């Protein structure tokens, strides 16, 4: 019936995409010496596995989240705790620092993204909003601005939320597996989302449209980050490979792998020049890759459990890592 | 020295934050965390009601031991992407209805779920408290519907004591790591009084055994 006619059209279109991409394959990216960072600061205080960490825009503050039921706002230069925020739900999977420094996002198995107000007359930190509406766990959240946040969840969708009204304004559908991570374009116009379909999608924030679908992993994508100029992504997955994708070519550009890495990738990030790609693994360490050659550039060792999160400051000065051993470390 | 008047004050604030985190940690350390798993249309609701949408948390106090149970039903998403978040729970409570045997039968699904959790890499040292639910319904059904419906090899009497023991054995032998964890099995129904005492006693045994390993007697 019409069901088979449409499935046949879909297969024909998949091949048109394949060939359009093959037609652009006239080169590969493959056609920094050694990186030796040291721990400069160790941030102690969490009493449970850390799942999320995010740098603020002043390159000095951090927000981190763990299963001890708290968020901690840290002074990365002095190691002082600035704030500690009790959570209503201890099963926190993600957090985010607003670019303005005014708010913190947080959530996980409660399927709610909570927004915390860090700058109040009372001196304390309060929940301003609970962005309920996802049916699956919140896997990742990122702010576009003080009134807008982007979320992804275990129900296979992503959403753009209006914080003041607490509503979804745009729902981004089309992934078939749980969505694991978000990354925002430098100009906020595009999102990239990774999922358990072993694929990533490029979304137009203003429309709800999926512009491109990137495939190639043998397993779930756990993390995605944008290359600093906005025209490429790096992804990391359970197949223990990181992959670089080209948004203008709609192609995989390079892969990062090694025979001795059979562990999953939990986090990816780029340095300012985009030359170094950093990835956290289930080996309790982080590998630093030469993003343009795929050589290993160096290793950040020192965690006693899985590295769960990475981040690089906006000024490019430091790398923070966090793990399941309950500590954060700042590398430079 | 070397700090300004305001940095000294910022440090004092940080130290008070650490004090409060430690005190809160000590309190958490004395709570019993229980994960609640089970078959659909089973006894999970029965157990919570007798003992007492995303993750649902229920609190209990019994014989001065404080418990928190985490119901992870509703979260119809990929288990492999979050179940590790319960590594560290004291015990897992797993619900199976005895009546599942003649309803792929529900009992087969219940055994498959049990095995996926029981032999999960994240729960290697976590014990299971197994509730075999609706025993009164089971007696009424077993006398007409034998266990050979889902367990063809069964050759015992079609009555509660032998058939129920058979079912218990079928679940307890799904434990592929008998050296690290025990399965505590209790037969219950919609009306009972002992489910809280049972969980309490099973938990107390789990605590003692974990302390033998922690203390080096292993």
């Amino acid at each position, epitope marked *: 019936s019409e069901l088979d006619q449409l499935r046949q059209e879909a297969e024909q279109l998949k091949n048109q995409i394949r060939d359009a991409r093959k037609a652009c394959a006239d080169a590969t990216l493959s056609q920094v010496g050694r990186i030796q960072m040291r721990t400069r600061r160790t941030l102690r205080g969490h009493l449970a596995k850390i799942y999320a960490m995010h740098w603020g825009t002043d390159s000095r503050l951090l927000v981190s989240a763990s299963q001890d039921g708290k968020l901690i706002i840290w002074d990365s230069y002095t190691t002082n705790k600035v704030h500690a925020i009790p959570l209503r739900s201890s099963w926190v999977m993600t957090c985010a620092y607003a670019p303005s420094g005014n708010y913190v996002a947080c959530g996980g198995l409660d399927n709610i993204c909570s927004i915390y107000n860090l700058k109040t007359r009372e001196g304390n930190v309060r929940v301003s909003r609970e962005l309920a509406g996802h049916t699956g766990y919140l896997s990742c959240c990122r702010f576009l601005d003080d009134n807008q946040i982007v979320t992804s969840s275990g129900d296979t969708t992503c959403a753009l939320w209006d914080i003041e009204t607490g509503q979804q304004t745009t729902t981004f559908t089309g992934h078939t597996g749980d969505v694991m991570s978000l990354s925002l374009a430098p100009d906020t116009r595009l999102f990239v989302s990774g999922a358990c379909d072993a694929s990533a999608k490029l979304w137009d924030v203003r429309e709800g449209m999926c512009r491109q679908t990137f495939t190639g992993h043998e397993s779930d994508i756990n993390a995605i980050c944008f290359f600093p100029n906005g025209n490429a992504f790096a992804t990391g997955s359970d197949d223990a490979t990181c992959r670089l994708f080209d948004l203008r070519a709609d192609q995989e550009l390079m892969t990062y792998s090694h025979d001795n890495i059979i562990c999953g990738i939990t986090s990816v990030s780029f340095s300012k020049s985009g030359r170094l790609l950093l990835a956290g693994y289930d080996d309790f360490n982080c590998n630093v890759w030469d993003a343009l050659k795929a050589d290993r550039a160096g290793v950040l060792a020192g965690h006693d459990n899985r590295v769960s999160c990475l981040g690089v400051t906006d000024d490019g000065m430091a790398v923070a890592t966090g793990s399941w051993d309950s500590f954060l470390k700042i590398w430079n | 020295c070397t700090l300004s008047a*305001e940095d000294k004050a*910022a440090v004092e604030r940080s130290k*008070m934050i650490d004090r409060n985190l430690r005190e809160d940690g000590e309190k958490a350390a004395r709570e019993v965390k229980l994960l609640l798993l089970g078959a659909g249309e089973s006894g999970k609701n029965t157990i919570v009601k007798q003992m007492k949408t995303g993750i649902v948390e229920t609190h209990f106090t019994f014989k001065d031991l404080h418990f928190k149970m985490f119901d992870v039903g509703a979260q119809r998403s990929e288990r492999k992407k979050w179940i590790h978040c319960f590594e560290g729970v004291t015990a897992i409570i797993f619900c199976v209805a005895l009546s599942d045997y003649d309803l792929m039968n529900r009992m087969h699904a219940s055994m498959k779920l049990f095995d996926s959790i029981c032999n999960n890499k994240w729960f290697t040292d976590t014990s299971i408290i197994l509730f075999l639910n609706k025993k009164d319904l089971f007696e009424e059904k077993i006398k007409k519907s034998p266990l050979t419906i889902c367990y063809p090899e069964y050759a015992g009497s079609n009555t509660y004591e032998e058939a129920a023991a058979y079912i218990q054995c079928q679940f307890e032998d799904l434990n592929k790591r008998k050296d690290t964890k025990e399965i505590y099995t209790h037969f219950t129904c919609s009306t009972d009084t002992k489910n809280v005492q049972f969980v309490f006693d099973a938990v107390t045994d789990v605590i003692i055994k974990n302390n033998l390993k922690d203390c080096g007697l292993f």
Partner: single-chain antibody, 232 residues
Framework: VQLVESGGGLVQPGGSRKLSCSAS????????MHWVRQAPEKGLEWVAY????????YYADTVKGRFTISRDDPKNTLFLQMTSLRSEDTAMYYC??????????????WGQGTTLTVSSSDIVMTQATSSVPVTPGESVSISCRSS???????????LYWFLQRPGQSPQLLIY???NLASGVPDRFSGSGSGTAFTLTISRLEAEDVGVYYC?????????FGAGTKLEL
């Protein structure tokens, strides 16, 4: 956010009084507190400080040994117990809110004050001009000098500016040498060298006429300049 002082009125020299300062509308236990005194015809003087958690206590050496500062967090109450009172202690006593963390703005809330009448190596700062005639819409520059650099090794300059309107307690305008207080309009701004500072009002409004004070917060005791009055 409210602070209400009490315990004022006339006491004879050698006697004693307690000022109470009841707080509401804020997380009192998270803030340190200060007492700031103002003699009837004078500027501001810092008297005492108690940290949040009561870990740290400082006193001016003009009151140390006679005054005791204490707090009772469960009752949101800040006390100052003064004994052996002198005619020197006649003043308005203000209860002042202060929280310290990276990015905080200390001294952002003052109470209204209680008036106490008693019968009969510091860093210091100079406000060279005691008075500036002004009109609405005019550009006004208020200067202040320090005997010591207020610029620390941590990169911050510890200079605060406050405005006391007639009949009102002081308002914080600026908390880092150049960092404007919340609720204060863009009309106000400031800068400095670490020893020389300026407060700028780009256009003066009639409502902003009053006495501007320069405060040092690098070291204890905290100190203030004499104050510059605008006349409109």
């Amino acid at each position: 956010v409210q602070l209400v002082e009490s315990g004022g009125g006339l006491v004879q020299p050698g006697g004693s009084r307690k000022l109470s300062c009841s707080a509401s509308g804020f997380a009192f236990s998270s803030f340190g507190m200060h007492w700031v005194r103002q003699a009837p015809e004078k500027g501001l003087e810092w008297v005492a400080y108690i940290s949040s958690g009561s870990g740290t206590i400082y006193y001016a050496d003009t009151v140390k040994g006679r005054f005791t500062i204490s707090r009772d967090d469960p009752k949101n109450t800040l006390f100052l117990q003064m004994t052996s009172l002198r005619s020197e202690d006649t003043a308005m006593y203000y209860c002042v809110r202060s929280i310290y963390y990276y990015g905080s703005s200390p001294f952002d809330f003052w109470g209204q004050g209680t008036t106490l009448t008693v019968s009969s190596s510091d860093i210091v700062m100079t406000q060279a001009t005691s008075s500036v005639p002004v009109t609405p819409g005019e550009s006004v520059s208020i200067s202040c000098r320090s005997s010591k650099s207020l610029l620390h090794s941590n990169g911050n300059t510890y200079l605060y500016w406050f405005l006391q309107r007639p009949g009102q307690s002081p308002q914080l305008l600026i908390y880092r040498m150049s960092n404007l207080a919340s609720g204060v309009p863009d009309r106000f701004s400031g800068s400095g060298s670490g020893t020389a500072f300026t407060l700028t009002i780009s256009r003066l409004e009639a409502e902003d006429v009053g006495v501007y004070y320069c405060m040092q917060h690098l070291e204890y005791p905290l100190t203030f300049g004499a104050g510059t009055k605008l006349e409109l």
